[PDB]
Amino acid sequence: TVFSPDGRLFQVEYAREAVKKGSTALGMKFANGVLLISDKKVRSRLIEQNSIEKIQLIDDYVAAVTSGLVADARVLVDFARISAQQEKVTYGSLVNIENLVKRVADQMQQYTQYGGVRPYGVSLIFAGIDQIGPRLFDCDPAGTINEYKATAIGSGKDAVVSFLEREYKENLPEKEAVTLGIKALKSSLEEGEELKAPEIASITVGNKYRIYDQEEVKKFL
Amino acid sequence: TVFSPDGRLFQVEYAREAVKKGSTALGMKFANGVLLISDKKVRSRLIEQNSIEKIQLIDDYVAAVTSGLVADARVLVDFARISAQQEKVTYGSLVNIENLVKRVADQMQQYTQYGGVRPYGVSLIFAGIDQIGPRLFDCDPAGTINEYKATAIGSGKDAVVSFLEREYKENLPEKEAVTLGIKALKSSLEEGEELKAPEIASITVGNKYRIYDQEEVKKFL
Amino acid sequence: TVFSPDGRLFQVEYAREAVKKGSTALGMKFANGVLLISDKKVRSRLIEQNSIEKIQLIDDYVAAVTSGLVADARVLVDFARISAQQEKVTYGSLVNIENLVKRVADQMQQYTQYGGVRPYGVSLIFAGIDQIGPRLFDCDPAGTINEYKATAIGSGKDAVVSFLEREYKENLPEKEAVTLGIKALKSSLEEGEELKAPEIASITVGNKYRIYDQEEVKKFL
Amino acid sequence: TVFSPDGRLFQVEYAREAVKKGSTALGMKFANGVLLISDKKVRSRLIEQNSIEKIQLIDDYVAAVTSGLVADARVLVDFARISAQQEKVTYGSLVNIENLVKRVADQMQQYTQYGGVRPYGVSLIFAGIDQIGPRLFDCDPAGTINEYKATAIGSGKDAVVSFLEREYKENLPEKEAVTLGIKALKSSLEEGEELKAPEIASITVGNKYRIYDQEEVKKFL
Amino acid sequence: TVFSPDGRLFQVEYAREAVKKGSTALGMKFANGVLLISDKKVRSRLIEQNSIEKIQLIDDYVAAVTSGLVADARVLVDFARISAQQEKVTYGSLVNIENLVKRVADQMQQYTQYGGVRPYGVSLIFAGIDQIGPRLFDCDPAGTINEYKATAIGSGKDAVVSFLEREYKENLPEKEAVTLGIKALKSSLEEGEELKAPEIASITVGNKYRIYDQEEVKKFL
Amino acid sequence: TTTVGITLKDAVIMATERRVTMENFIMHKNGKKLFQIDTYTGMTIAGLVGDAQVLVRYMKAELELYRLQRRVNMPIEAVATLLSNMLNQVKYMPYMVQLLVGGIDTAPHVFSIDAAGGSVEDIYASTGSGSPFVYGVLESQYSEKMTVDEGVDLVIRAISAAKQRDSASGGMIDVAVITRKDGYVQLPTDQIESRIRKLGL
Amino acid sequence: TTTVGITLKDAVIMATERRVTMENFIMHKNGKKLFQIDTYTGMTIAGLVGDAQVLVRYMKAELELYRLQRRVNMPIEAVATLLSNMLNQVKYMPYMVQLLVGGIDTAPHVFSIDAAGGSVEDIYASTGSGSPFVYGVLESQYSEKMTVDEGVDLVIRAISAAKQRDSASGGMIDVAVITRKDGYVQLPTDQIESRIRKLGL
Amino acid sequence: TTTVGITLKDAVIMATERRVTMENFIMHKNGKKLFQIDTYTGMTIAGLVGDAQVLVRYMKAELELYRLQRRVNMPIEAVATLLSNMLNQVKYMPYMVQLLVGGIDTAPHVFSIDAAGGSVEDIYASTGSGSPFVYGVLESQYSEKMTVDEGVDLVIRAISAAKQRDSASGGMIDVAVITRKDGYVQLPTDQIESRIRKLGL
Amino acid sequence: TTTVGITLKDAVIMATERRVTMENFIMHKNGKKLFQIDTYTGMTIAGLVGDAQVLVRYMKAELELYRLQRRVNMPIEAVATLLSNMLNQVKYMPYMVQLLVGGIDTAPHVFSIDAAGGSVEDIYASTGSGSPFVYGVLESQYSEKMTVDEGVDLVIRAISAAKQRDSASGGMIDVAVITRKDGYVQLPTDQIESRIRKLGL
């Protein structure tokens, strides 16, 4: 990875293109909690859907969704899990999610600076509750971090964000937040398509991360 | 391995082409068990067929078939065997096959990210029974993992899958599952060819992995 | 990174181009203190502005702002923080800020001399108070250090400096220094645009670094 | 760095071009002492001139000036300082300055022979008094060392040397040596320009290195 | 460094071209001793000639002259000095100069075989007296060693050797050997030029290496 | 120190004393020896406090990561096996501890793990300087057909007896009960004190 | 050495003696054992001076960096946990120290940390050769419902008693009080001397 | 060995004895224990000669480099802190030394540094086998309101007393005075001998 | 072993005995302890022969290389400083030696270097088991205003006395004289024997 005459890093920009081809997922803050929704694309019938999860847990109070190269995403998630455990052993607990996200982002950043390796073709959304409150972060291939009230990654990122920028309201009831999230995903669909029951997970202050059941998802679909 | 302007990794895609030239094999779940069938291609008569096995065992309850570069496949199988033993020594037993598959996939993933090496030109199918139940996974050169009810690898992959998507039924008797598998392979043959007695292995819950004898195979052929 | 026939290092010059695309920030000395102002660009409404800080603290008496590749900047800031702590442990206190800046610059310089890595696409401004007095330094991708009475980095660097060269006065009251800084940033704006409440921090001799509140900023805007 | 068909090393020659673009400085021996003068170029008014020094001390009896890439020069000066301290710890004192210069030059030479690195774009002048007497050395990017009665580096090198070759006299009074040095620098100026108060330092036998004050410099300007 | 279709190593041949541009020096055996003469080229008047030596000592009974890249030559001389000391510590004394020369040549040879480095652009002449007698060796960039009765290196090598092949006589008196050496150098001069007092050193059996004074040189000039 | 763990038809009951000795006196009257390390798994520690606390932190991290990765709680025997390996690897520079690991998978289990990594499963076990007194009580009164309430009372009596003879034992009794239905439940001191009075202790 | 730390409803009070022994005599009458390591956190040291001073420097650096990175003061329990790990890692080549860590988060806490990395929370604790005398006084006079001023007086009495029996104890008493309102506050010697006179000590 | 360092209003006075013992006898009557290590900083050594001489060379190099890099003389406390770290790092393979570091920044300071890296600031201190005798004299005669000349005389008396009881002490007395005005000044033996006669020693 | 080195106005005189002990008997009557290591520098060794011989070889190589590189003879103090560093670096696995280094720069110097790297300059010194006897003689008879011939005679008497009381001492006396004019000169046995007879020894 080297600089162009414009001061650009092409391998990083190309990695971003890989991300754009991944599945669509979004996250949004709501009253005393954070919501994650993944637009799981259903293909074939020979796939064991029961074993396919898009929302990973890093620990009981932190979750993430990824979009981009699947193999790379798996690796970064494992890294985040291990990193989270190291912090708990060292201090006794996790205090600020932001630092976990940074440790991950730094792992990604170095792959854009040192030769012999290619950057991770992965975009992540981190969500959870910590000492400060409910938090929601993005992390791109470059290793750039931003905290959001609401965000999205994947091929539908632009459509979903555009929708959210208009419709998103603060301090919504969990049910309203989920309802909104579903509408946002639907707006990103190709003409003639439909939204399959998405994977939904949420967490509220004082609780552990909660993953919705299949029936619970359908009720909002 | 670097990114193209499209966000693609050509060396990985090329590795996939190597896989497409390998032999055809399939796997399918059935009532309380998992079936593996390999379309061993018979050539010459000077080859010691008795010593040619396509279905490898990783341990008493886990088996795999591979397609692609033979030398690479052998290496990955050895890796999986060693990895499986490490888990048993560490915890006393193997609980979740999925984790074994991941350890293998991660070994493969890094070869697509670090320079100085080429990716493995190998696709694998893992099958076995663990704490959860009968399971069936694929793993490609990229290092991507998917759990299936039924799948296939090799040059006949597309034909076999197409067939299975139409004919596959859940919770079949072992004998029916084998019968179906044979039909699936036959559908992938070049016009004018025939199916030679394939290698068949299966496992049922509570038992160890069972490999069919020569006569047993012919009865379904 | 190698020399051209002109004795130039293109990768370094290209890194400088990356810096030119970053946000605008300035720093200026005033009577018994140093001021830092960052032109935080406000985009969208879905970004958690409360968590977005442009002025970092290295320690209680030293702060910095950066412009260029965000991921790289984060890394250098972390380096500076760790380095500052090492000095305190070794000697019991930080005596001369200049040396901290050099340690950072040297980290940057080596990336322009050794192959296998690219230079940091980051320009930094360091400010604080030490044994000598209030101090203000720049550090560019090359690893060049200069102490200023007033300076600026980012896309608006040229406009801001030009303004300051004309309007800057020594030994101003803090309030006058801030007022001047705001005017300087406004002069760098594209026609038709406006300045959003910038992030402001200052330190005076004998005190710790002080970050302005939101209301305090608006009073000068 | 490899050889051309002419037996030339282009990367070294290119490094020399980098040096030619640096500031001008000279050194000359005089009766029982050595003089260093640096043509500090004054730019802007927002630069803290009080903190800008061109003449570095390596130890109480040894000083140096550099011209070329600033970041590289800083690194070599630090190296020389550390090296000088190692010698004192090892033997109890510094006996021959020539050896210090060689240790620096050897650090530079290896960067012209090993791949993976670029040569230092720096020319240095070393001056001081040791067991033998007042001494004055140059060191270029190649790692070549020469002892001079009088010399110069930087863009004005050719003009200054030409002047000195004609006007230089041995065993001058310090005041006469300084007067001569100022004339030499003036002769190298572009038409219409003027010489700003230069940085001047000198050492005499039995004394420590002495840096001139601002008023002292003006008296000769 | 790789082979051409002719079995040639171009980087080595190019290094030889670098050598051809160096100063001229010769060596010759005489009755019970060995003589070294270096055609020091005098340039400018601002160079401290008193500190410029072309004939280096490796130890009290061994000396060398070099031609080619100056920085590289310095490095090889240092190597030879260190190597000579190691032998003395190990065995108590130096017995055969040939082995010292080989250790140096081997250091040079490896730079023509391993990548990542360039060959030394240096030709050396070694002379001294050991257990066997007065000896005189050459060593080129390739790492080739030859013992001579009389030899030469540098730009004037061809002219000097041609002369010596015709005029050289064995077992000459030291004074006659020096007289001859001076004539040999003069024959290599460009038309219209003159020979400046060269640096002369000699050693006789049972003695230590002796360097001629300035007046002694002029008497033969 | 006194730690006690017993199994019943479908439950594991573990209890400890709170006294901690440092610098040869009762520096702390209210320490902690009984830990939850998983949903259905608890651990008691004995021996050097420093070493023991470190091991607990490692085990918590290790089991949590296991759960997340494999989507299942680690088998109790596997938990014991980890410790066996962790401790044996440093047997020449060992942790100065004695551990009890208990919990439920498909059945209740209690493992006793020594500092050499030796791990043995049993019906009941105790560790610490007061363990000989606990064994006396359990050996005489323990019954496999006991109810969970009878179990809790026995554990209190066993520890209470140890507190009367072991000078290193003392403090309030901590009791935890693990069942599949409820999971790891730590009993209120209100209930424990009530039982203590009823038992005439 | 004598160090004392106690908790009250909403405050932590820590105090130490100043005497330092080197080469078997009272080389220094005015050393320092009570340190501020964070905005609301203090530490007292005991044992070998060299080791203790090094640990204090590390802790200051570690907590400052933590604050800057996470924009929040480290929890007291986390502070204790760091030390536990730092000390345990070198247990075979240990720091010869005994530490007290006290401060306020949402509540006042005092931790006692041994050289093995053993860390136990308590209501009050003391370290050093004179600690047995302090415990005597606190055990008899300490009350949870005490005011901050009553607290300070108790701490002075406890140390003063130690100074009368422990030959390794002596010097002026340093007292610091930590509250959320004021933060870490070091008391003037003027106030301490005044209290000493009033208490008839 | 006897080394003495005291502070006064605006000065630091340090002195030592010259006797050096090797192979159990007075091999050298005129060694050196008092060193200048910076413009306004001096050091005295005690303990093993080899170790001490090495440390002095390191400190000179370290402080000189510091000055050049930061364009300022290192604070005395920082000088002491370096030694603390240098010595503590090798505490298990230690330097067999006792050091005094004194000098002026904005105020005069004297630090006593042990082999464990323990560093404590004081008004006066002494090291070496004869230090107990020096403390006796200083404890009785030292006064904070003393002049620099009164200070020098006290230091001579204190060492002279040590020379009469400590068999390891002896030789001519070296005295150095550090002030901001003059910097580190080594007193002539002519002045010291004169004072010795006047004092009736 | 007995080695002696003294300074005079413009000269250094060094002498040793030749006896070498191995396996607890006089295995060698004619060893070598006095070495030239530079043009104007000599060294005497004592202690373990193996270690000492190795050091001499290193010093010769080190000083020769220095000369060639810097075109000047190394200062005597610098020579001593090297040894100090070389020996101190291995102080825990030390060379079992005692060295004397003497020579001329602008003045004559004699350094005594112990196995810990301790280096002290003096007017005269001696090493080896017989050194106490040499000191007796020198202490009584040595005079700073002595001539080089008077110096040589004193050195012979001092060693001769040691040979009469130290069972580890004996053999012919080696004497070397170092001056700027002549450099290191080893005296003929013919001259030494002549002096011995004249002195009535």
Curated annotation (Swiss-Prot), chains A, B, C, D, E:
Keywords: Cytoplasm, Proteasome. It is found in: Cytoplasm. Its main location: cytoplasm. InterPro entries: Ntn_hydrolases_N, Proteasome_alpha, Proteasome_alpha-type, Proteasome_asu_arc, Proteasome_asu_N, Proteasome_sua/b. The formation of the proteasomal ATPase PAN-20S proteasome complex, via the docking of the C-termini of PAN into the intersubunit pockets in the alpha-rings, triggers opening of the gate for substrate entry. Interconversion between the open-gate and close-gate conformations leads to a dynamic regulation of the 20S proteasome proteolysis activity. Changing residue 69 to A/E/G: Prevents PAN to stimulate gate opening. SUPFAM superfamilies: N-terminal nucleophile aminohydrolases (Ntn hydrolases). GO terms for biological process: proteasomal protein catabolic process; ubiquitin-dependent protein catabolic process. One of its GO terms (cellular component) is cytoplasm. One of its GO terms (molecular function) is threonine-type endopeptidase activity. Changing residue 70 to D/G: Prevents PAN to stimulate gate opening. HAMAP family: Proteasome_A_A. Belongs to the peptidase T1A family. The configuration of the closed gate contains an opening large enough to allow rapid entry of tetrapeptides but able to impede the entry of proteins and longer peptides. PANTHER family: PROTEASOME SUBUNIT ALPHA/BETA (PTHR11599). The 20S proteasome core is composed of 14 alpha and 14 beta subunits that assemble into four stacked heptameric rings, resulting in a barrel-shaped structure. The two inner rings, each composed of seven catalytic beta subunits, are sandwiched by two outer rings, each composed of seven alpha subunits. The catalytic chamber with the active sites is on the inside of the barrel. Has a gated structure, the ends of the cylinder being occluded by the N-termini of the alpha-subunits. Is capped at one or both ends by the proteasome regulatory ATPase, PAN. Component of the proteasome core, a large protease complex with broad specificity involved in protein degradation. The T.acidophilum proteasome is able to cleave oligopeptides after Tyr, Leu, Phe, and to a lesser extent after Glu and Arg. Thus, displays chymotrypsin-like activity and low level of caspase-like and trypsin-like activities. This is Proteasome subunit alpha. It comes from Thermoplasma acidophilum (strain ATCC 25905 / DSM 1728 / JCM 9062 / NBRC 15155 / AMRC-C165).
UniProtKB/Swiss-Prot annotation, chains F, G, H, I:
The active site is at 1 (nucleophile). GO terms for molecular function: endopeptidase activity; threonine-type endopeptidase activity. It catalyses: Cleavage of peptide bonds with very broad specificity. It comes from the Archaea. Its main location: cytoplasm. One of its GO terms (biological process) is proteasomal protein catabolic process. Pfam families: Proteasome (PF00227). It is found in: Cytoplasm. Its EC number is 3.4.25.1. PROSITE patterns: PROTEASOME_BETA_1, PROTEASOME_BETA_2. GO terms for cellular component: cytoplasm; proteasome core complex, beta-subunit complex. InterPro entries: Ntn_hydrolases_N, Pept_T1A_Psome_bsu_arc, Pept_T1A_subB, Proteasome_bsu_CS, Proteasome_sua/b, Proteasome_suB-type. The 20S proteasome core is composed of 14 alpha and 14 beta subunits that assemble into four stacked heptameric rings, resulting in a barrel-shaped structure. The two inner rings, each composed of seven catalytic beta subunits, are sandwiched by two outer rings, each composed of seven alpha subunits. The catalytic chamber with the active sites is on the inside of the barrel. Has a gated structure, the ends of the cylinder being occluded by the N-termini of the alpha-subunits. Is capped at one or both ends by the proteasome regulatory ATPase, PAN. Belongs to the peptidase T1B family. Component of the proteasome core, a large protease complex with broad specificity involved in protein degradation. The T.acidophilum proteasome is able to cleave oligopeptides after Tyr, Leu, Phe, and to a lesser extent after Glu and Arg. Thus, displays chymotrypsin-like activity and low level of caspase-like and trypsin-like activities. This is Proteasome subunit beta. It comes from Thermoplasma acidophilum (strain ATCC 25905 / DSM 1728 / JCM 9062 / NBRC 15155 / AMRC-C165).
